[PDB]
């Protein structure tokens, strides 16, 4: 007797004869497992490893008529160590590379029963979900990363996943803190995937990540632009300075090569040229072309009124030719990766 | 009395029929879980990872009427494995990234019973906690980082939190010293946080991390300042030696950008410009203008002109220090008084 021992007797009578090996309505209709997620954070998005470390509260919600109880009006909140002694969905994420349930103090789990037998079960999870990235437009790119929720052991005629609350089934999207990206949107989808062993239900949660160019435009593009502008000062230094005309050109060439090298130890070994590599290619070609143009000012001045006039005219042209050509190239590049 | 068999049978009687799934006074008023912490060490603080690591002793107090016992005057201390047999709260840290209870020798947990049924449950934890920072004032910045504590499953209908001792509940922070920061202040908070599933109690601990400027003077400002003033040596080099001033200026440019990349080697790829970045931009601008001034001098020298070149050299010799002094004045006044 009593309002404590009565609840104890209720719970023990529920778990007396309960079979954990059988799904609800085993042999009957499928079990409709509603679910929804609350995003805690995305720790990082990695191009080197092609994955992103998502952390979240993951909830699941299903009927189980073997756990119905009467008289007690409370939504019993049982200690989470009971969840080891019940049937729980066999859900899993296909594209996850490595994940864990947070385990400090007591493993972070919630289980709550209701009088009409429906169960709520939730976890706090950190998952390193894979996300292959299309870096052809890097760093002006945007990425689609997804989490593929799926049941492993049970088929479409055993389980039926659905987003609980529909459109509102995922929250906390606006507390994701990524320096390099901003989540333009998130989208929720449900599907039936098919394997040799049968059809399965799948729920897809996807993010569309737009990059912020502020870091690169200041850290790698601005120095390249300035070094290219520096390379033009050779066209203001008088051609008598044969050693300095070389020194400037070769130093800018080596500096463009150096701006290149600082990237390669921080990115994957992708086999195709990216937008950043296109810009570095173009700027390096400008410095190399300035160096060649100095070489053919020197040649014509010393070796070949051709000894005077040709060199004078070429030097006078350069000071306007290179700025014009570089401006054209820069405009073409930016409109190529912005307007189309 | 504390006879061995009597204690054994008393404890067995306490646990005989004891139910794990139901919290103390189930259905009745909430469990008032008192919280207490003893900071052992803040192991690290990281801007690149936007987090800090903390090692601590974490204690919790509550009375479970089911564990009241009489005839024994001792506050019994039991082997920690009783924790798996008793009810213990589902407290967890919201903003931790990874944490673990220390398992050296045997898992670092404590349970001590008292005749009135009070349970002292304590355990030693190392936790990495997320704290993204306001780096806009990087070398002069001050940060607030917190440890958030909540019950995962039990709402305010079932559990209540309070700091046992009030403002005195956290200790050891007064002995924490860090290479990069100093704990100016720490403040304790209690509040209720409401989700769709209900109102959940929270306790939170916060630190005012003020950064120490000493490091960056040594590693950044000294090199940049010395290489900046080195660039003004060009004006002390006669323009008759046309090929040396270009080498000097371009060497200074190379050194400046080399110093800049070393910062990018130790920072998050954060978008916005930081005050350190602004200072580096100013120094690089002065170096760039120092080189461009020789280029302009060589233009004028070939376009009386020796006199013009010498006058420009003297005028730069005066003005570059003056302009840099104005820059330094504005920079420090702005980033100190703002």
């Amino acid at each position: 007797p009593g309002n404590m021992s009565f609840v104890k007797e209720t719970v023990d009578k529920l778990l007396k004869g309960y079979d954990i090996r059988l799904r609800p309505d085993f042999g009957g209709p499928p079990v409709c497992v509603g679910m929804n997620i609350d995003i805690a954070s995305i720790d990082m998005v990695s191009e080197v490893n092609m994955d992103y470390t998502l952390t979240m509260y993951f909830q699941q919600y299903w009927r189980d008529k073997r756990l119905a109880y009467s008289g007690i009006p409370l939504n019993l909140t049982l200690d989470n160590r009971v969840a080891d002694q019940l049937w729980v969905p066999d859900t899993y994420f296909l594209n996850d590379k490595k994940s864990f349930v947070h385990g400090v103090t007591v493993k972070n789990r919630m289980i709550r029963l209701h009088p009409d037998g429906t169960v709520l079960y939730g976890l706090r999870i950190t998952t390193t979900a894979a996300c292959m990235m299309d870096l052809r437009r890097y760093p002006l790119d945007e990425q689609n990363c997804t989490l593929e929720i799926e049941s492993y052991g049970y088929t479409t005629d055993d389980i039926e996943f659905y987003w609980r609350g529909g459109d509102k089934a995922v929250t906390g999207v606006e507390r994701i803190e990524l320096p390099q990206f901003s989540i333009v949107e998130h989208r929720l989808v449900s599907r039936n995937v098919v394997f040799a062993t049968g059809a399965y239900p799948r729920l897809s949660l996807s993010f569309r990540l737009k990059r912020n160019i502020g870091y690169f435009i200041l850290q790698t593009y601005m120095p390249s632009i300035l070094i290219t502008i520096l390379s033009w000062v050779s066209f203001w230094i008088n051609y008598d300075a044969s050693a300095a005309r070389v020194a400037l050109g070769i130093t800018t060439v080596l500096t463009m090569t150096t701006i290149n090298t600082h990237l390669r130890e921080t990115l994957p070994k992708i086999p195709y040229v990216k937008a950043i590599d296109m810009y570095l290619m173009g700027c390096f070609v400008f410095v190399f072309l300035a160096l060649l143009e100095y070489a053919f000012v020197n040649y014509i001045f010393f070796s070949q009124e051709l000894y005077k006039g040709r060199a004078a005219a070429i030097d006078r042209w350069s000071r306007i030719v290179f700025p014009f050509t570089f401006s054209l190239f820069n405009l073409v590049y930016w409109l190529y990766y912005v307007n189309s | 009395p504390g006879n061995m068999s009597f204690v054994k049978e008393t404890v067995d009687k306490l646990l005989k029929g004891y139910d794990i799934r139901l919290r103390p006074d189930f259905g009745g008023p909430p469990v008032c879980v008192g919280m207490n912490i003893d900071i052992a060490s803040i192991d690290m603080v990281s801007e690149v990872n936007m987090d800090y690591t903390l090692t601590m002793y974490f204690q919790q107090y509550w009375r479970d009427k089911r564990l009241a016992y009489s005839g024994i005057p001792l506050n019994l201390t039991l082997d920690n494995r009783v924790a798996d047999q008793l009810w213990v709260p589902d407290t967890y840290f919201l903003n931790d990234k990874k944490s673990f209870v220390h398992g050296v020798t045997v898992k670092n947990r404590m349970i001590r019973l008292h005749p009135d049924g009070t349970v002292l449950y304590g355990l030693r934890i190392t936790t990495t906690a997320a704290c993204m920072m306001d780096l806009r004032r990087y070398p002069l910045d001050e940060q607030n980082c917190t440890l958030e504590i909540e019950s995962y499953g039990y709402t305010t209908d079932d559990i209540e939190f309070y700091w046992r001792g009030g403002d005195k509940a956290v200790t050891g922070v007064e002995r924490i010293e860090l290479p990069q920061f100093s704990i100016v202040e720490h403040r304790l908070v209690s509040r209720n946080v409401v989700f769709a599933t209900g109102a959940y109690p929270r306790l939170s601990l916060s630190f005012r991390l003020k950064r120490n400027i000493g490091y960056f003077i040594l590693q950044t400002y000294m090199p940049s300042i010395l290489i900046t003033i080195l660039s003004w040596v060009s004006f002390w080099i006669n323009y008759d030696a046309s090929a040396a001033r270009v080498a000097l200026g371009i060497t200074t440019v190379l050194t400046m950008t080399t110093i800049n990349t070393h910062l990018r080697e130790t920072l998050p790829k954060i978008p916005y410009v930081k005050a350190i970045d602004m200072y580096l931009m100013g120094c690089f601008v002065f170096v760039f203008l120092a080189l461009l001034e020789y280029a302009f001098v060589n233009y004028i020298f070939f376009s009386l002109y020796k006199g013009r070149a010498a006058a420009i050299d003297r005028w730069s010799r005066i003005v570059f220090p003056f302009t840099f002094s104005l820059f330094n004045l504005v920079y420090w006044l702005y980033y100190v008084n703002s």
Partner: nanobody, 108 residues
Framework: GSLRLSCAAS????????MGWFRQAPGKEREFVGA????????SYADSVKDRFTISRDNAKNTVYLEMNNLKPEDTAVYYC??????????????????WGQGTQVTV
């Protein structure tokens, strides 16, 4: 008609990365309207105003603006502005918002 509001924040706005717009009226509990994240722009709205109102953040002026488009009579309320902590809970619930504005009235 249509209307627009502005909420300017000062102080340690970094520790309060999210700002929410609520509203209240005599005989009504405080109602959520929308939210915005500093520097992120990722808004969320109450279903009652969704697709009418929008919220945006001017991060330089440290100010947020709510577009109160296509007014309807029931939109008559005092539109408190509020700020939310880094690790507080759900956005739809006023109790999670610490600092509150003076609550401009709106009338239709």
């Amino acid at each position: 008609g249509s209307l627009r509001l502005s909420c300017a924040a000062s102080g340690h706005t970094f520790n309060y990365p999210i700002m929410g717009w609520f509203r209240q009226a005599p005989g009504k509990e405080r109602e959520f309207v929308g939210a915005i994240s500093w520097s992120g722009g990722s808004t969320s709205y109450a279903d009652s105003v969704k697709d009418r109102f929008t919220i945006s953040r001017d991060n330089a002026k440290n100010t947020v603006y709510l577009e109160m488009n296509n007014l309807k009579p029931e939109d008559t309320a005092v539109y408190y502005c509020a700020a939310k902590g880094r690790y507080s809970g759900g956005l739809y619930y006023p109790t999670n918002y610490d600092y509150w504005g003076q609550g401009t009235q709106v009338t239709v």
